[PDB]
Amino acid sequence: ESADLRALAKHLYDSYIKSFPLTKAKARAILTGTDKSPFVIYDMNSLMMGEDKIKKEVAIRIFQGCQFRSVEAVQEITEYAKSIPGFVNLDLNDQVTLLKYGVHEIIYTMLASLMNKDGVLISEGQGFMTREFLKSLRKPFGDFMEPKFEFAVKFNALELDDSDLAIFIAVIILSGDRPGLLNVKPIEDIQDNLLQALELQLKLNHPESSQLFAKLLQKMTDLRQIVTEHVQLLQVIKKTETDMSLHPLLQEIYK
C-alpha cells in the first residue's frame, strides 16, 4: 500500500537529516547566493589564506584532507545504514559487507550535492575549492577529483532533492549482489521495498520527470566505474609515495 511506502519514505528522510550535517538543500543555498558565503580556494595563496580563515607538499595535504573527510563520511553513512529498517537484523558479516562496498558509491552520490561544474564545497561548506585548482594538482593527484566532477554535473541534472536521495542511498546499501554476501534473499527483500518506496517518491515528487526512476537506477553504473578508477589511482599512490599514510578504516574498506 502507498501509505506504508510514504511512511517509509518519511522515516528515511528523517534519519538522513539526523545523520548528515550538510544536506544538499544547504549546499545549494551556499553555492547559489550573505551569512553563508564560502571562502574560495583557487590557488596556493588562497589556500594559505584559507588555512587561516577557515581552519607536507600541498597536493599531499589536500589528499589527506580528502581522506579525513571520507572517513567522517563513512561514519555518517554507517549511522544512517543502521536506521534502514531491517539492516541491523541482518547477519553481522553481511552488514559489514554491505557497508564495505556501498560506502564509496554513497560518498560520490552525496559529494555531487556539494559540487557544481566549477568546484566543490569543503569544510562543512565554509570553503569552496575550485575544480581547476584540483585539476592542476601535481601528478597523479590532479586526476583524482575530475571523474567525480564529471559524474556530478550529469547526476545533478536529475535535480533530486534530499528526500529522494535518502531513499536512493538506502537502495544502494541494500544491494544483494555484493561479493561474499551470506544471505542474499532478505537483503533483496529489503531492497525491493526500498525500490517501491523510491518509485512512489519520484512519481509524487517529480510528476513531470518521465522515467526518472529508471534514469536514477542507471546512474548506479557510473558510480561503480568511479570506484574502480579511484582504486587504481590509490595503488599508484601506495607505490610512488611510500611515506604517505593511508587511514586504516579506508585501507580495510579497499582490501
Ligand SMILES: CCCCCCCC/C=C/CCCCCCCC(=O)O
Ligand atoms: C582539502 C580539504 C578537503 C577537500 C576535499 C575535496 C573533496 C571533498 C571530499 C572528498 C572525498 C572523496 C575523494 C577521494 C578520497 C580519497 C580517500 C578515499 O576515500 O579512499
